[PDB]
A paper describes a structure:
SEL1L, the mammalian homolog of Hrd3p, associates with HRD1, mediates HRD1 interactions with the ER luminal lectin OS9, and recognizes substrates to be degraded. SEL1L is required for ER homeostasis, which is essential for protein translation, pancreatic function, and cellular and organismal survival. The SLR motif is a structural motif that closely resembles the tetratricopeptide-repeat (TPR) motif, which is a protein-protein interaction module.
We found that the central domain of SEL1L, comprising SLR motifs 5 through 9 (SEL1Lcent), forms a tight dimer with two-fold symmetry due to domain swapping of the SLR motif 9. Crystals of SEL1Lcent grew in space group P21 with four copies of SEL1Lcent (a total of 82 kDa) in the asymmetric unit. The assignment of residues during model building was aided by the selenium atom positions, and the structure was refined with native data to 2.6 Å resolution with Rwork/Rfree values of 20.7/27.7%. The two SEL1Lcent molecules dimerize in a head-to-tail manner through a two-fold symmetry interface resulting in a cosmos-like shaped structure. Each protomer is composed of ten α-helices, which form the five SLRs, resulting in an elongated curved structure, confirming the primary structure prediction. However, the last helix, 9B, at the C-terminus adopts a different conformation, lying parallel to the long axis of helix 9A instead of forming an antiparallel SLR. Helix 9B from one protomer inserts into the empty space surrounded by the concave region in the other monomer, forming a domain-swapped conformation. In this interface, Leu 516 and Tyr 519 on helix 9B are located in the center, making hydrophobic interactions with Trp 478 on helix 8B, Val 444 on helix 7B, Phe 411 on helix 6B, and Leu 380 on helix 5B from the SEL1Lcent counterpart (Interface 1 detail). For this structural geometry, two adjacent residues, Gly 512 and Gly 513, in SEL1L confer flexibility at this position by adopting main-chain dihedral angles that are disallowed for non-glycine residues.
Residue numbers in the entry:
A (entry chain B): 353 to 524
B (entry chain A): 352 to 524
Protein backbone atom coordinates (compact mmCIF):
# COMPACT_ATOMS: atom_id res chain seq x y z
CA UNK A 1 0.00 0.00 0.00
CA UNK A 2 2.92 2.40 0.74
CA UNK A 3 4.51 1.12 -2.50
CA UNK A 4 1.49 2.18 -4.50
CA UNK A 5 1.85 5.77 -3.30
CA UNK A 6 5.55 5.81 -4.08
CA UNK A 7 4.90 4.26 -7.45
CA UNK A 8 2.50 7.08 -8.14
CA UNK A 9 4.98 9.72 -7.12
CA UNK A 10 7.35 7.92 -9.48
CA UNK A 11 4.95 7.96 -12.43
CA UNK A 12 4.16 11.59 -11.73
CA UNK A 13 7.86 12.41 -11.77
CA UNK A 14 8.02 10.80 -15.22
CA UNK A 15 5.17 12.87 -16.58
CA UNK A 16 2.08 10.80 -15.84
CA UNK A 17 -0.44 13.66 -15.91
CA UNK A 18 -3.18 11.65 -14.28
CA UNK A 19 -0.77 10.83 -11.47
CA UNK A 20 0.24 14.44 -11.05
CA UNK A 21 -3.34 15.60 -10.72
CA UNK A 22 -4.34 12.72 -8.51
CA UNK A 23 -1.43 13.28 -6.18
CA UNK A 24 -1.91 17.02 -6.28
CA UNK A 25 -5.44 16.53 -4.99
CA UNK A 26 -4.40 14.03 -2.29
CA UNK A 27 -1.74 16.48 -0.99
CA UNK A 28 -4.43 19.17 -1.18
CA UNK A 29 -6.60 17.24 1.31
CA UNK A 30 -4.47 14.54 2.86
CA UNK A 31 -5.30 11.12 1.53
CA UNK A 32 -5.27 7.36 1.08
CA UNK A 33 -1.79 7.06 2.54
CA UNK A 34 -0.75 10.58 1.72
CA UNK A 35 0.18 13.30 4.14
CA UNK A 36 -1.21 16.77 3.39
CA UNK A 37 1.06 19.31 1.68
CA UNK A 38 -0.26 22.45 -0.10
CA UNK A 39 3.22 22.88 -1.53
CA UNK A 40 3.30 19.56 -3.22
CA UNK A 41 -0.31 20.18 -4.32
CA UNK A 42 0.44 23.49 -6.04
CA UNK A 43 3.56 22.01 -7.66
CA UNK A 44 1.80 18.93 -8.99
CA UNK A 45 -1.05 21.06 -10.24
CA UNK A 46 1.36 23.34 -12.10
CA UNK A 47 3.00 20.29 -13.65
CA UNK A 48 -0.25 18.84 -14.95
CA UNK A 49 -1.61 22.23 -15.92
CA UNK A 50 1.48 23.03 -17.96
CA UNK A 51 0.88 19.68 -19.63
CA UNK A 52 -2.62 20.98 -20.47
CA UNK A 53 -4.81 19.20 -17.91
CA UNK A 54 -8.06 21.12 -17.38
CA UNK A 55 -8.62 19.75 -13.89
CA UNK A 56 -5.16 21.00 -12.84
CA UNK A 57 -5.92 24.45 -14.19
CA UNK A 58 -9.19 24.58 -12.29
CA UNK A 59 -7.51 23.44 -9.05
CA UNK A 60 -4.98 26.27 -9.50
CA UNK A 61 -7.80 28.76 -10.17
CA UNK A 62 -9.26 27.62 -6.87
CA UNK A 63 -6.03 27.97 -4.96
CA UNK A 64 -5.64 31.52 -6.29
CA UNK A 65 -9.22 32.45 -5.59
CA UNK A 66 -8.79 31.31 -2.00
CA UNK A 67 -5.10 32.09 -1.28
CA UNK A 68 -2.72 30.86 1.38
CA UNK A 69 0.81 31.73 2.43
CA UNK A 70 1.97 29.35 -0.22
CA UNK A 71 -0.41 30.58 -2.92
CA UNK A 72 -1.09 34.20 -2.30
CA UNK A 73 -4.68 35.12 -3.12
CA UNK A 74 -5.29 36.73 -6.53
CA UNK A 75 -8.64 36.92 -8.37
CA UNK A 76 -6.89 37.84 -11.54
CA UNK A 77 -4.93 34.62 -12.04
CA UNK A 78 -7.80 32.57 -10.59
CA UNK A 79 -9.73 34.07 -13.48
CA UNK A 80 -6.91 33.21 -15.88
CA UNK A 81 -7.14 29.55 -14.85
CA UNK A 82 -10.95 29.24 -14.65
CA UNK A 83 -11.03 30.63 -18.19
CA UNK A 84 -8.43 28.15 -19.50
CA UNK A 85 -10.26 25.31 -17.72
CA UNK A 86 -13.72 26.40 -18.85
CA UNK A 87 -12.72 26.65 -22.50
CA UNK A 88 -12.16 22.90 -22.51
CA UNK A 89 -14.89 22.67 -20.86
CA UNK A 90 -14.23 21.74 -17.27
CA UNK A 91 -17.27 22.17 -15.00
CA UNK A 92 -15.13 23.62 -12.25
CA UNK A 93 -13.88 26.23 -14.71
CA UNK A 94 -17.43 26.87 -15.90
CA UNK A 95 -18.54 27.38 -12.30
CA UNK A 96 -15.64 29.77 -11.63
CA UNK A 97 -16.45 31.97 -14.60
CA UNK A 98 -20.05 31.67 -13.52
CA UNK A 99 -19.35 33.16 -10.10
CA UNK A 100 -17.15 35.84 -11.67
CA UNK A 101 -20.01 36.97 -13.96
CA UNK A 102 -22.63 36.64 -11.22
CA UNK A 103 -20.80 38.91 -8.76
CA UNK A 104 -18.58 40.94 -11.10
CA UNK A 105 -15.32 39.33 -9.94
CA UNK A 106 -12.72 40.63 -12.33
CA UNK A 107 -15.33 41.09 -15.02
CA UNK A 108 -18.41 43.17 -15.61
CA UNK A 109 -21.52 41.61 -14.12
CA UNK A 110 -23.35 39.65 -16.80
CA UNK A 111 -26.33 37.48 -15.85
CA UNK A 112 -26.80 35.69 -19.19
CA UNK A 113 -23.18 34.52 -19.27
CA UNK A 114 -23.42 33.38 -15.65
CA UNK A 115 -26.58 31.52 -16.44
CA UNK A 116 -25.09 29.69 -19.39
CA UNK A 117 -21.95 28.75 -17.51
CA UNK A 118 -23.79 27.38 -14.49
CA UNK A 119 -26.00 25.49 -16.90
CA UNK A 120 -22.97 23.92 -18.66
CA UNK A 121 -21.48 22.87 -15.33
CA UNK A 122 -24.85 21.64 -14.12
CA UNK A 123 -25.40 19.36 -17.10
CA UNK A 124 -22.07 17.60 -16.42
CA UNK A 125 -23.29 16.68 -12.93
CA UNK A 126 -21.36 19.29 -11.06
CA UNK A 127 -23.26 19.78 -7.84
CA UNK A 128 -22.12 23.34 -7.29
CA UNK A 129 -23.16 24.38 -10.77
CA UNK A 130 -26.53 22.90 -9.99
CA UNK A 131 -26.75 24.79 -6.70
CA UNK A 132 -25.77 28.08 -8.32
CA UNK A 133 -28.23 27.47 -11.18
CA UNK A 134 -30.94 26.69 -8.64
CA UNK A 135 -30.31 29.91 -6.75
CA UNK A 136 -30.53 31.95 -9.92
CA UNK A 137 -33.87 30.31 -10.78
CA UNK A 138 -35.11 30.72 -7.24
CA UNK A 139 -34.19 34.41 -6.96
CA UNK A 140 -34.99 35.25 -10.59
CA UNK A 141 -31.50 36.63 -11.15
CA UNK A 142 -30.51 35.59 -14.70
CA UNK A 143 -34.11 34.79 -15.59
CA UNK A 144 -37.77 35.08 -14.52
CA UNK A 145 -38.49 33.11 -11.35
CA UNK A 146 -39.13 29.38 -11.79
CA UNK A 147 -39.45 27.63 -8.44
CA UNK A 148 -39.83 24.32 -10.18
CA UNK A 149 -36.54 24.73 -12.11
CA UNK A 150 -34.96 25.62 -8.81
CA UNK A 151 -36.53 22.45 -7.39
CA UNK A 152 -35.03 20.32 -10.16
CA UNK A 153 -31.48 21.57 -9.78
CA UNK A 154 -31.63 21.57 -5.98
CA UNK A 155 -32.89 17.99 -6.16
CA UNK A 156 -30.07 16.93 -8.43
CA UNK A 157 -27.56 18.57 -6.06
CA UNK A 158 -29.04 16.66 -3.12
CA UNK A 159 -28.71 13.38 -5.00
CA UNK A 160 -25.03 14.18 -5.44
CA UNK A 161 -25.53 15.46 -8.98
CA UNK A 162 -27.10 12.44 -10.64
CA UNK A 163 -29.62 9.82 -9.53
CA UNK A 164 -26.88 7.12 -9.73
CA UNK A 165 -24.35 9.03 -7.55
CA UNK A 166 -25.42 7.10 -4.46
CA UNK A 167 -24.12 3.94 -6.04
CA UNK A 168 -20.73 5.35 -6.82
CA UNK A 169 -20.52 6.49 -3.22
CA UNK A 170 -21.81 3.08 -2.11
CA UNK A 171 -18.50 1.54 -3.18
CA UNK A 172 -16.09 4.43 -2.41
CA UNK B 1 -42.21 20.57 4.60
CA UNK B 2 -39.91 17.83 3.28
CA UNK B 3 -43.01 15.66 3.54
CA UNK B 4 -44.82 18.20 1.44
CA UNK B 5 -42.09 17.83 -1.18
CA UNK B 6 -42.23 14.04 -0.96
CA UNK B 7 -45.97 14.39 -1.49
CA UNK B 8 -45.36 16.83 -4.36
CA UNK B 9 -43.19 14.15 -5.96
CA UNK B 10 -45.85 11.51 -5.38
CA UNK B 11 -48.15 13.92 -7.18
CA UNK B 12 -45.81 14.35 -10.14
CA UNK B 13 -45.16 10.61 -10.43
CA UNK B 14 -48.88 9.97 -10.35
CA UNK B 15 -49.31 12.36 -13.31
CA UNK B 16 -46.68 10.61 -15.44
CA UNK B 17 -43.42 12.35 -14.53
CA UNK B 18 -40.80 9.73 -15.35
CA UNK B 19 -38.04 11.26 -13.19
CA UNK B 20 -40.27 11.33 -10.17
CA UNK B 21 -41.37 7.71 -10.57
CA UNK B 22 -37.75 6.59 -10.81
CA UNK B 23 -36.56 8.79 -7.95
CA UNK B 24 -39.25 7.68 -5.53
CA UNK B 25 -38.78 4.11 -6.68
CA UNK B 26 -35.16 4.41 -5.61
CA UNK B 27 -36.07 5.88 -2.25
CA UNK B 28 -38.53 3.01 -1.65
CA UNK B 29 -35.83 0.58 -2.79
CA UNK B 30 -33.34 1.54 -0.11
CA UNK B 31 -35.17 3.58 2.48
CA UNK B 32 -34.31 7.21 2.25
CA UNK B 33 -34.70 10.88 2.98
CA UNK B 34 -38.26 10.87 4.27
CA UNK B 35 -39.35 7.65 2.65
CA UNK B 36 -39.94 4.14 3.98
CA UNK B 37 -38.26 1.10 2.36
CA UNK B 38 -40.93 -0.61 0.23
CA UNK B 39 -39.94 -3.08 -2.51
CA UNK B 40 -43.51 -3.17 -3.79
CA UNK B 41 -43.83 0.56 -4.47
CA UNK B 42 -40.28 0.42 -5.78
CA UNK B 43 -41.16 -2.22 -8.30
CA UNK B 44 -44.38 -0.39 -9.32
CA UNK B 45 -42.60 2.89 -9.89
CA UNK B 46 -39.82 1.12 -11.83
CA UNK B 47 -42.36 -0.64 -14.04
CA UNK B 48 -44.25 2.61 -14.60
CA UNK B 49 -41.11 4.40 -15.67
CA UNK B 50 -39.67 1.47 -17.71
CA UNK B 51 -42.85 1.36 -19.78
CA UNK B 52 -42.28 5.06 -20.46
CA UNK B 53 -38.79 4.42 -21.91
CA UNK B 54 -36.48 5.24 -18.95
CA UNK B 55 -33.14 3.38 -18.95
CA UNK B 56 -32.65 3.83 -15.20
CA UNK B 57 -36.03 2.19 -14.48
CA UNK B 58 -35.04 -0.75 -16.69
CA UNK B 59 -31.66 -1.11 -15.00
CA UNK B 60 -33.21 -1.06 -11.53
CA UNK B 61 -35.64 -3.79 -12.60
CA UNK B 62 -32.75 -5.77 -14.02
CA UNK B 63 -31.13 -5.45 -10.62
CA UNK B 64 -34.05 -6.63 -8.50
CA UNK B 65 -34.56 -9.52 -10.99
CA UNK B 66 -30.94 -10.74 -11.05
CA UNK B 67 -31.04 -10.41 -7.32
CA UNK B 68 -34.43 -11.98 -6.43
CA UNK B 69 -36.52 -10.97 -3.41
CA UNK B 70 -39.94 -11.98 -2.07
CA UNK B 71 -41.60 -9.23 -4.10
CA UNK B 72 -39.58 -9.96 -7.20
CA UNK B 73 -39.00 -13.67 -7.72
CA UNK B 74 -35.51 -14.25 -9.09
CA UNK B 75 -35.13 -14.68 -12.82
CA UNK B 76 -31.80 -13.84 -14.32
CA UNK B 77 -33.26 -14.22 -17.78
CA UNK B 78 -35.59 -11.24 -17.43
CA UNK B 79 -32.90 -9.61 -15.34
CA UNK B 80 -31.01 -10.05 -18.59
CA UNK B 81 -33.99 -8.72 -20.56
CA UNK B 82 -33.87 -5.44 -18.67
CA UNK B 83 -30.09 -5.13 -18.39
CA UNK B 84 -30.13 -5.46 -22.14
CA UNK B 85 -32.84 -2.85 -22.65
CA UNK B 86 -30.89 -0.41 -20.41
CA UNK B 87 -27.53 -1.19 -22.02
CA UNK B 88 -29.00 -0.65 -25.46
CA UNK B 89 -29.59 2.98 -24.35
CA UNK B 90 -26.18 3.68 -22.84
CA UNK B 91 -27.16 3.17 -19.22
CA UNK B 92 -23.98 2.21 -17.26
CA UNK B 93 -25.89 0.08 -14.78
CA UNK B 94 -27.24 -2.06 -17.57
CA UNK B 95 -23.91 -2.20 -19.31
CA UNK B 96 -22.39 -3.35 -16.04
CA UNK B 97 -25.23 -5.93 -15.72
CA UNK B 98 -24.31 -7.51 -19.05
CA UNK B 99 -20.70 -7.32 -17.95
CA UNK B 100 -21.34 -9.45 -14.86
CA UNK B 101 -23.51 -11.77 -16.90
CA UNK B 102 -20.70 -12.51 -19.34
CA UNK B 103 -17.98 -12.55 -16.72
CA UNK B 104 -19.68 -15.33 -14.79
CA UNK B 105 -21.96 -16.96 -17.40
CA UNK B 106 -25.21 -15.96 -15.70
CA UNK B 107 -28.01 -16.82 -18.06
CA UNK B 108 -25.57 -16.47 -20.89
CA UNK B 109 -22.48 -18.26 -22.09
CA UNK B 110 -19.17 -16.97 -20.62
CA UNK B 111 -17.42 -14.41 -22.84
CA UNK B 112 -14.56 -12.32 -21.46
CA UNK B 113 -14.46 -10.22 -24.63
CA UNK B 114 -18.02 -9.02 -24.04
CA UNK B 115 -17.58 -8.62 -20.28
CA UNK B 116 -14.50 -6.55 -20.90
CA UNK B 117 -16.16 -4.32 -23.51
CA UNK B 118 -19.33 -3.73 -21.46
CA UNK B 119 -17.30 -2.88 -18.35
CA UNK B 120 -15.32 -0.43 -20.57
CA UNK B 121 -18.50 1.29 -21.67
CA UNK B 122 -19.77 1.70 -18.13
CA UNK B 123 -16.35 2.74 -16.75
CA UNK B 124 -16.09 5.51 -19.32
CA UNK B 125 -19.22 7.05 -17.75
CA UNK B 126 -17.71 7.27 -14.26
CA UNK B 127 -19.50 4.20 -12.97
CA UNK B 128 -17.39 2.99 -10.10
CA UNK B 129 -18.48 -0.65 -10.27
CA UNK B 130 -17.67 -1.05 -13.96
CA UNK B 131 -14.27 0.46 -13.25
CA UNK B 132 -13.75 -2.12 -10.51
CA UNK B 133 -14.72 -5.02 -12.74
CA UNK B 134 -12.51 -3.73 -15.55
CA UNK B 135 -9.63 -3.25 -13.12
CA UNK B 136 -10.07 -6.79 -11.84
CA UNK B 137 -9.94 -8.23 -15.35
CA UNK B 138 -6.77 -6.34 -16.25
CA UNK B 139 -5.15 -7.05 -12.85
CA UNK B 140 -5.83 -10.79 -12.85
CA UNK B 141 -5.51 -11.15 -16.64
CA UNK B 142 -8.99 -12.53 -17.09
CA UNK B 143 -10.12 -11.29 -20.49
CA UNK B 144 -6.70 -10.32 -21.78
CA UNK B 145 -3.06 -10.38 -20.62
CA UNK B 146 -2.41 -8.78 -17.24
CA UNK B 147 -1.94 -5.05 -17.62
CA UNK B 148 -0.91 -3.76 -14.26
CA UNK B 149 -1.07 -0.15 -15.36
CA UNK B 150 -4.60 -0.44 -16.76
CA UNK B 151 -5.62 -2.20 -13.61
CA UNK B 152 -4.08 0.65 -11.71
CA UNK B 153 -5.86 3.36 -13.75
CA UNK B 154 -9.29 1.93 -13.11
CA UNK B 155 -8.63 1.18 -9.50
CA UNK B 156 -7.55 4.77 -9.13
CA UNK B 157 -10.67 6.08 -10.82
CA UNK B 158 -12.82 3.86 -8.59
CA UNK B 159 -11.00 5.04 -5.51
CA UNK B 160 -11.71 8.65 -6.47
CA UNK B 161 -15.44 7.84 -6.59
CA UNK B 162 -15.40 7.31 -10.37
CA UNK B 163 -13.94 10.65 -11.38
CA UNK B 164 -11.34 12.97 -9.85
CA UNK B 165 -14.12 15.56 -9.20
CA UNK B 166 -16.51 13.02 -7.62
CA UNK B 167 -15.38 13.60 -4.05
CA UNK B 168 -16.61 17.18 -4.26
CA UNK B 169 -20.04 16.10 -5.41
CA UNK B 170 -20.45 13.15 -3.08
CA UNK B 171 -19.45 15.34 -0.12
CA UNK B 172 -22.72 17.27 -0.56
CA UNK B 173 -25.07 14.36 -1.16
Amino acid sequence: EEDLIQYYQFLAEKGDVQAQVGLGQLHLHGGRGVEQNHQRAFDYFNLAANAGNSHAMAFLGKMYSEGSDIVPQSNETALHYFKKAADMGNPVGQSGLGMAYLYGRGVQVNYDLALKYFQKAAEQGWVDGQLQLGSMYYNGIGVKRDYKQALKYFNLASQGGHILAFYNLAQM
